[PDB]
C-alpha cells in the first residue's frame, strides 16, 4: 500500500499552486515519506503532520493566514512539546526536515520511526514550512518552522 | 552515554583540518548521529560507516587517495548493495545524508534505525563524502558519494 499526498504551495490571496506529491510507504522500521515536489523555495524545511485534514487558511488578527486551518502539530499523546522524530516526548507528527534543492525540487526521503502503519496518519495534514526545524520549541516554537509554505491532506 | 567521534577534513597534501565532532547516542528507535561540525563544504553529503578504524589515505594505482584506509562501506550482513537506512538490502553502514549549510556548519541529526547499541559501531570509521547520496548504486556507485571529504574513527 502507499498513500499519495497531493501537495500545494499555499497562497490565500493569489491562489494555491500544485507542486507535486509526497508518497508515504511502510518500511520495516516505520513510515517513509518520499517527496516528489517541484517549484518550492530552496532550503531545509520543517515537515510535520498537523491535526486537521485541511489545508485551508484561517483568519488571525485581521489577516488570512496560509494553512492555519490545519491546526497544530498532530499530538495524539498530548506531549505538548515539539521534538525529534525518534523521541517519545515529541508530537507524533514530528518528521525529519524536508530538503528542497537549489532547483526547487524535493526528492529526499525521510523516516518517521514511531509511525508504523499507513492507517495511523490518515485524516491529518502534511505541512512544509518556510523555516527549518531544530526539533525544539526553543529558541523558536515548533522548531522555527514559521509560516506554512505547502500542504496536503493525508487520506 | 555517547560516543564522541572527532572528525577531520582530509587533505593528504596540505594536512588535515579539525572540523569538530559527531556524537552518537542511543534512542528508542536506533542510533542517532548528531553532528557538531564546522568549516565543511556546503551541501547534502553522503554519510556512512566504513569498515576499518582508520581515516588514513591509501595509495591506489599510484594516486594517494584521501580516506581510502577506511575501506568500503561497513557491510557485516554482506548485502553488497548500497541502499536506504531503513532497507535490509542496504549496507549496515548506510546513514541518512549529512546537511552542511552554506556557513560550513553541520548540526542536523540523523537516525540509523537498524543500529541499536553503541558497541556495534565501535571499531569502524565515520565518513563524509564530497558528493551526495541517492541511496542506490545507480546511476553512480555507492550513492554518488565520490571522494572522501572528512572522517573520524569510532572508538
Ligand atoms: C542545509 C541547507 C542548504 C544546503 C545543503 C544548501 C546547499 C546548496 C547547494 C549544494 C547549492 C548548489 C551548489 C552551488 O552552486 O553552490 C546551493 C545553492 C544555493 N543556495 Fe543553498 N543550501 C542550503 C540552504 C540555503 C538557504 C537557506 C539559502 C537562502 C535562502 C540558500 C541559498 C542558495 C543560493 C542563492 C544558491 C545558488 C544557486 C543559484 O545560483 O541560483 N541555500 N545551496
Ligand atoms: Cu508543521
Ligand atoms: Cu562512505
Ligand atoms: Zn511538533
Ligand atoms: Zn553503502
From Swiss-Prot, chains A, B:
Binds 1 copper ion per subunit. It catalyses: 2 superoxide + 2 H(+) = H2O2 + O2. Cu cation binds at residues 48, 50, 73, 129. Disulfide bonds join 55-151. It comes from the Bacteria. It is an enzyme of class 1 (oxidoreductase). Zn(2+) binds at residues 73, 82, 91, 94. GO terms for molecular function: copper ion binding; superoxide dismutase activity. Its EC number is 1.15.1.1. Keywords: Antioxidant, Copper, Disulfide bond, Metal-binding, Oxidoreductase, Periplasm, Signal, Zinc. Transmembrane segments: none annotated. Its cofactor is Cu cation; Zn(2+). Its main location: periplasm. It is found in: Periplasm. GO terms for cellular component: periplasmic space. Destroys radicals which are normally produced within the cells and which are toxic to biological systems. May play a role in the interactive biology of organisms with their hosts and so contribute to their capacity to cause disease. Homodimer. Belongs to the Cu-Zn superoxide dismutase family. This is Superoxide dismutase [Cu-Zn]. It comes from Haemophilus ducreyi (strain 35000HP / ATCC 700724). The gene is sodC. The chain holds residues 45 to 199 of 199 of the full protein.
